[PDB]
Design a protein around this nucleic acid. Structure first.
Ligand SMILES: Nc1nc2c(ncn2[C@@H]2O[C@H](COP(=O)(O)OP(=O)(O)NP(=O)(O)O)[C@@H](O)[C@H]2O)c(=O)[nH]1
Ligand SMILES: [Mg+2]
Ligand SMILES: [Mg+2]
Ligand SMILES: [Mg+2]
Ligand SMILES: [Mg+2]
Ligand SMILES: [Mg+2]
Ligand SMILES: [Mg+2]
Ligand SMILES: [Mg+2]
Ligand SMILES: [Mg+2]
Ligand SMILES: [Mg+2]
Ligand SMILES: [Mg+2]
Ligand SMILES: [Mg+2]
Ligand SMILES: [Mg+2]
Ligand SMILES: [Mg+2]
Ligand SMILES: [Mg+2]
Ligand SMILES: [Mg+2]
Ligand SMILES: [Mg+2]
Ligand SMILES: [Mg+2]
Ligand SMILES: [Mg+2]
Ligand SMILES: [Mg+2]
Ligand SMILES: [Mg+2]
Ligand SMILES: [Mg+2]
Ligand SMILES: [Mg+2]
Ligand SMILES: [Mg+2]
Ligand SMILES: [Mg+2]
Ligand SMILES: [Mg+2]
Ligand SMILES: [Mg+2]
Ligand SMILES: [Mg+2]
Ligand SMILES: [Mg+2]
Ligand SMILES: [Mg+2]
Ligand SMILES: [Mg+2]
Ligand SMILES: [Mg+2]
Ligand SMILES: [Mg+2]
Ligand SMILES: [Mg+2]
Ligand SMILES: [Mg+2]
Ligand SMILES: [Mg+2]
Ligand SMILES: [Mg+2]
Ligand SMILES: [Mg+2]
Ligand SMILES: [Mg+2]
Lengths: 85, 205, 123, 262, 131, 82
RNA sequence: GGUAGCUAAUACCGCAUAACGUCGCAAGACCAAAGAGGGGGACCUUCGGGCCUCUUGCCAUCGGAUGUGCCCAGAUGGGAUUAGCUAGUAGGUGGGGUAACGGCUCACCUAGGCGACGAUCCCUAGCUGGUCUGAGAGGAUGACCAGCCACACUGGAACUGAGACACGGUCCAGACUCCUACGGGAGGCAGCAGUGGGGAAUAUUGCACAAUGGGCGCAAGCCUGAUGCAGCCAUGCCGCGUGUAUGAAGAAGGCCUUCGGGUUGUAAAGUACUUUCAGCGGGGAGGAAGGGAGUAAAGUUAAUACCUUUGCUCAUUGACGUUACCCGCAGAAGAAGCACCGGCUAACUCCGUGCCAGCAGCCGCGGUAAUACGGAGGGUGCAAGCGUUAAUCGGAAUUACUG
């Protein structure tokens, strides 16, 4: 709307895009774990977890899975992966 | 906001000399004082408890030149102020600069006392004062305009001023044409045909 | 009576109703006025009082007095109704303002010309 | 197109206009326009009025400061219309010979000269006096402004002009020639949903609108006040019954014209 | 030939006058398509030449009857910038026309060749020679 | 960001600013944390003209509080320890 | 706008590196970032600038301050001619979720949760500090001012970001409207001002960022209808003037009269006198503080440069603005209206009229001497206002808790 910072729009749009996929891969990774859990392979479970552990802690530092939101994930995961394995 | 009309016409209805034609000779007379304030002035007005109750303050107003909107305010003041609202109200009425003027005889009547204050011809503890309503605190010292001092009018005024009751709360002169307001007028040192429980009574409902 | 009673059903004021409720509770209203007639007062007094039925702005239609002697009002006209009743003509709770909108004030009237809406007759 | 070729080929570039000061060359700088018209302003969302100015000399530029010679008050310009064919347009900056539009708020009249400073006034502009009749008394049984507002808005225009006596009602209008019809029509076009009709009115004059020294006038605004009116624009006027009653009126004397001023 | 005196010299501001129902307003609409302001054209009263294209008689009542008050126009033709007026025909009705002449440096009179010279045609020449 | 600025509580022509601690994001005369002195841009040469709880001001600054360019021009215009 | 291609960064992304952080009882796992300026002795190397340095910026962890979330309780309109309300409803366990607790979500499990201390349902309504009234208790109310909340064409949703579910952002739908070369596009004044419309009625399409305050910037500065001013309106509150003195058996004229006179009335005239305020003319505070150019500081430094700092000198910084205010000129000169007068109610007669015309807040006036109608004289009351109407509290102990 005729007001210079309509570029603020196309600007936000670019970010939306960028974030979307970052955030998108974010979860798919965590997924692999839940799968391993509903699947049983505890070796394959820590397997997935270790590869996501960093890739989560990272996006928080970047500012999209903010703060303890990662902690939660890593935590309640570790809490189950060995609750019965 | 000023009266502007037959000054005696008034004194005849209030049935007293309201000091409106002070100037040279005073003490009314030469105007039929009393017996014809109108066309039916002859009449014997047996007036109501209200009648007098009003007529009292309605007098006081005249004998100073104050109007209602302002007078009403004056009353509100005295009531808020601790002590006999009656005398308090008088103390406010006497504290008027127009009054401290005529009172210190720098003018014929209090109708002349204004023409001056209104025309920046007096001052207080220095600075000139134009509002014929200034509230003259204690230690204040009014003084005819150093500029226009002693004139065809004010000169002749001090004349009879000196030959009047002469106050007690103020210390006047004649050459320095300045007085001090030494203290607020007590109840004892002023009066006449003026009742307080009659004017204060009125402002109650 | 009882406090305990008052605690229960607590006392309730009696709301008030204005003698003039052709709305908005506003100083005056404007109306087209549907008829200009005259009628007759209550038992004691007799005359041909001047009144007008008036379609108001708010949709209420209501009769109104025409004070002073003689008026210009008629068929359609537009006036500004005022309030204050007329105890001689019941059902007449309003006075059309003389000297407002389509209303002519009183010809030659010289006293209390404020009401009856007339301008100083050249001092 | 020939007559156009002829138009371009022969017809004058902006010409000098005369003033009570000097021959004003078009070639000069320093802006100098003169109004000449405050068109029958409808107009899609305003009273606008938009006075039409000629531009005799100098270049107009949007933010420039100008001087209304008549009222002797300096005025800054911002919204200054350029009329793309019976249509307001924003807004550019103008050169001699163009036609510019402004925004009348009782400030502009007819023949109001505008300079950048030179106090002088263009000797042109006709401005003549109306004949009469009328009394629009309106169907729509009122309102009342929209009718009146309509009338006190078609009147700072040059065609007609109203007359409202000291009896609130009784609206008189006067009166280009006899086309008192655009009034009725602009009474249900432009921006007023009124209707309005006519009558005959005991008025020959026209009238003529007076003022000068005080006190004397207050004795005049009193004696023959019966009889005296006031216009949209808040002044002044008489309104007479005939010619003899016109002469005697002025003959009360000796305070001023005549005055028409549109 | 500075950018100032050039703009001035290339300008040309004129009237268009005649007796009521001669051709003002029509010749005007046509002058407007020679200036690329109207890509099509029309008639008057929106009449015989169809299409809601009348036009450029400002107002409204004009389009109901026939012409009222001076419309004003600016367009480019050849090497010039024309300022065009549209002066009402009718005795009682204008005024205005006269005051409008005060804004023109020259003037074009339309004449009905089926009528010759009519009344307000003669009266308009008198007003013309004034300047 | 907590700042110490002036609110215009004077009167037409005769202002009367009032130094106060407040979140910057606020209206001039808006939510403030606490008054902390004033400043009379009139007063005339007499008995007074300004006042500051400078020992509170320094408290707030000590908590990361910026100052008005005009608030500053007060603080030190009245010196500090004399 | 669409395809193809080229290019930089404090844009984006790995890697390195990691604890006082995150996960884990521990062991151990895993995460970050940015540079850009003003300069300058060495030496200077591939003499871009590396390097020294101060300045500003980036990361991580723990704090401070502010701001915001979230929770409980009590209180916060009317209606019982509204008596029952509720399936995610009430709780539990378990995943998920959020910044955070939580039914917030879902799964399964108990069958609960609320309600006459008035739920539910209708009607109304932004809440508060306060405001008007009142002796108070209360009643009424919540414009302007400040705090809290909510909405920004109607309905819905998320995105971006510390913070939005976003007045002058985005997407969808709806109603409307505008442009269009017809294929397609565009917009939301409950921001300032302004138009229409409605109404008994509510303002200029004004000036300026000079002051205060906000956003960016190292800074100057830029942006700012916030703000500061102005315009319009007696709408109010508060001031002030329209003249002050003197003046007669007391004019004419008007008014009543039993005609002898009374009264308007010191009122006017006349005589002296004063000029505020307006009108014309001069002089001229404060709102101004800071910034912009040069000089010194055991400031730091390798450095007298740069930067900061504090004093110092110069030029300068306003919208209001023909400012406020001061001083002269002239001359009572330019400025009084409105309601009322039978009673409550201060204040009276003549005439006209005649239960007509008409007044009236209540009682009540008018059918032949109307202090009540209308006019006139006179009188009373307020005064640039006065009146009417409307509305709230009072009087109303007339919803009475006080009572
Ligand atoms: N046959 C014909 N009719 C023409 C021509 N030009 C104009 N007209 C007719 O003249 C009629 C008047 O048209 P218009 O332009 O209004 O004339 P006018 O001179 O503008 N009228 P007015 O004097 O009222 O402004 C038009 O309706 C049109 O039909 C022409 O060249 N030929
Ligand atoms: Mg940008
Ligand atoms: Mg959990
Ligand atoms: Mg007053
Ligand atoms: Mg009503
Ligand atoms: Mg009777
Ligand atoms: Mg009546
Ligand atoms: Mg009846
Ligand atoms: Mg009278
Ligand atoms: Mg035509
Ligand atoms: Mg409640
Ligand atoms: Mg209930
Ligand atoms: Mg509501
Ligand atoms: Mg009580
Ligand atoms: Mg309430
Ligand atoms: Mg409001
Ligand atoms: Mg926004
Ligand atoms: Mg908007
Ligand atoms: Mg607006
Ligand atoms: Mg408006
Ligand atoms: Mg600023
Ligand atoms: Mg801008
Ligand atoms: Mg601006
Ligand atoms: Mg006589
Ligand atoms: Mg003056
Ligand atoms: Mg200054
Ligand atoms: Mg200073
Ligand atoms: Mg500093
Ligand atoms: Mg300047
Ligand atoms: Mg001056
Ligand atoms: Mg008088
Ligand atoms: Mg009264
Ligand atoms: Mg009374
Ligand atoms: Mg009485
Ligand atoms: Mg009466
Ligand atoms: Mg009444
Ligand atoms: Mg009689
Ligand atoms: Mg009578
Ligand atoms: Mg009660």
């Amino acid at each position: 709307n005729i007001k210079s910072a309509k570029k603020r729009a196309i600007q936000s749009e670019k970010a939306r895009k960028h974030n979307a996929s970052r955030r998108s891969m974010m979860r798919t990774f965590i997924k692999k774990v839940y799968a391993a859990i509903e699947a049983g392979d505890k070796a394959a479970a820590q397997k997935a977890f270790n590869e996501m552990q960093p890739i989560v802690d990272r996006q928080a530092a970047k500012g999209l899975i903010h703060k303890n939101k990662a902690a939660r994930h890593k935590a309640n995961l570790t809490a189950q992966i060995n609750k019965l394995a | 906001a000023r009266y502007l009309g037959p000054k005696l016409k008034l004194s005849r209805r209030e049935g007293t000399d309201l000091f409106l034609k002070s100037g040279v000779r005073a003490i009314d007379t030469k105007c039929k004082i009393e017996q014809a304030p109108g066309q039916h002035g002859a009449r014997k007005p047996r007036l109501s408890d209200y009648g007098v109750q009003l007529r009292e303050k309605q007098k006081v107003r005249r004998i100073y030149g104050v109007l209602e909107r302002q007078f009403r305010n004056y009353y509100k003041e005295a009531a808020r102020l601790k002590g006999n609202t009656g005398e308090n109200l008088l103390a406010l009425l006497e504290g008027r600069l127009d009054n401290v003027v005529y009172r210190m005889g720098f003018g014929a009547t209090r109708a002349e006392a204004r023409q001056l204050v209104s025309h920046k011809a007096i001052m207080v503890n220095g600075r000139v004062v134009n509002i014929a309503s200034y509230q003259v605190s204690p230690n204040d010292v009014v003084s005819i305009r150093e500029k226009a001092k002693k004139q065809s009018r004010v000169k002749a005024a001090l004349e009879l001023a000196e030959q009047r009751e002469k106050p007690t709360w103020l210390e006047v002169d004649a050459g320095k044409m300045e007085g001090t307001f030494k203290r607020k007028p007590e109840r004892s040192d002023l009066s006449a045909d003026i009742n307080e429980h009659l004017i204060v009574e009125l402002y109650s409902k | 009576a009882t406090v305990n009673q008052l605690v229960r059903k607590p006392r309730a004021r009696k709301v008030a109703k204005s003698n003039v409720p052709a709305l908005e509770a506003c100083p005056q209203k404007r109306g087209v006025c549907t008829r200009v007639y005259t009628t007759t007062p209550k038992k004691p007094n007799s005359a041909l009082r001047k009144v007008c039925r008036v379609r108001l702005t708010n949709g209420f239609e209501v009769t109104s007095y025409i004070g002073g002697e003689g008026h210009n009002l008629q068929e359609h006209s537009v006036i500004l109704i005022r309030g204050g009743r007329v105890k001689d003509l019941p059902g007449v709770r309003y006075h059309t303002v003389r000297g407002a909108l389509d209303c002519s004030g009183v010809k030659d009237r010289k006293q209390a010309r404020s009401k009856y809406g007339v301008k100083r007759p050249k001092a | 197109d020939h007559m156009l070729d002829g138009l371009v080929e022969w017809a004058p570039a902006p010409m000098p206009r005369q003033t009570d000061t000097r021959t004003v060359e078009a070639s000069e700088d320093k802006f100098t326009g003169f109004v000449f018209k405050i068109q029958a302003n409808m107009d899609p969302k305003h009273r606008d009025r938009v006075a039409f100015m000629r531009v005799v000399s100098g270049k107009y530029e949007k933010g420039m400061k100008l001087r209304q010679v008549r009222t002797a008050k300096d005025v800054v310009i911002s919204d200054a219309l350029t009329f793309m064919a019976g249509d307001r347009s924003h807004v550019e900056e103008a050169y001699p010979g163009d036609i510019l539009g402004l925004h009348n708020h009782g400030t502009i009249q007819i023949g109001d000269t505008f300079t950048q400073g030179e106090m002088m006034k263009f000797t042109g502009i006709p401005n003549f006096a109306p004949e009469l009749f009328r009394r629009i008394r309106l169907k729509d049984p009122l309102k009342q402004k929209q009718l009146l507002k309509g009338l006190v808005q078609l009147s700072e225009e040059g065609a007609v002009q109203v007359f409202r006596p000291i009896s609130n009602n009784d609206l008189i209008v006067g009166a280009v020639g006899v086309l008192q019809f655009d009034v009725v029509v602009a009474r249900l076009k432009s921006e007023y949903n009124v209707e309005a009709v006519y009558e005959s009115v005991n008025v020959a004059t026209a009238r003529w609108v007076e003022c000068a020294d005080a006190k004397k006038f207050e004795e005049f605004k009193r004696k023959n006040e019966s009889q005296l009116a006031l216009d949209g624009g808040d002044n002044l006027a008489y309104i007479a019954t005939s010619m003899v009653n016109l002469r005697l009126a002025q003959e009360r004397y000796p305070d001023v014209q005549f005055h028409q001023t549109r | 030939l500075s950018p100032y005196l050039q703009e001035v010299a290339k300008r040309r501001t004129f009237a268009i006058i005649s007796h009521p129902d001669a051709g003002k307003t029509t010749i005007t609409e046509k002058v407007l398509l020679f200036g690329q302001a109207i890509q099509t054209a029309g008639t008057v009263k929106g009449r015989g030449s169809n299409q809601h294209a009348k036009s450029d008689w400002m107002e409204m009542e004009k389009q109901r009857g026939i012409s009222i008050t001076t419309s004003v126009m600016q367009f480019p033709y050849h090497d010039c910038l024309v300022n065009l007026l549209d002066t009402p025909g009718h005795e009682d009705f204008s005024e205005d026309t006269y005051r409008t002449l005060t804004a023109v440096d020259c003037c074009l009179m339309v004449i009905d060749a089926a009528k010759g010279v009519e009344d307000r045609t003669r009266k308009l020449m008198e007003v013309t020679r004034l300047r | 960001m907590v700042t110490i600025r002036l609110a215009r509580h004077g009167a037409k022509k005769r202002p009367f600013y009032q130094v106060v601690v407040a979140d910057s994001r606020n209206a001039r005369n808006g939510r403030f944390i606490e008054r902390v002195g004033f400043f009379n841009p009139i007063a005339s040469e007499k008995e007074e003209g300004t006042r500051l709880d400078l020992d509170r001001i320094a408290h707030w600054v000590g908590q990361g509080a910026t100052i008005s360019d005009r608030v500053a021009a007060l603080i030190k215009e009245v010196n500090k320890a004399a």
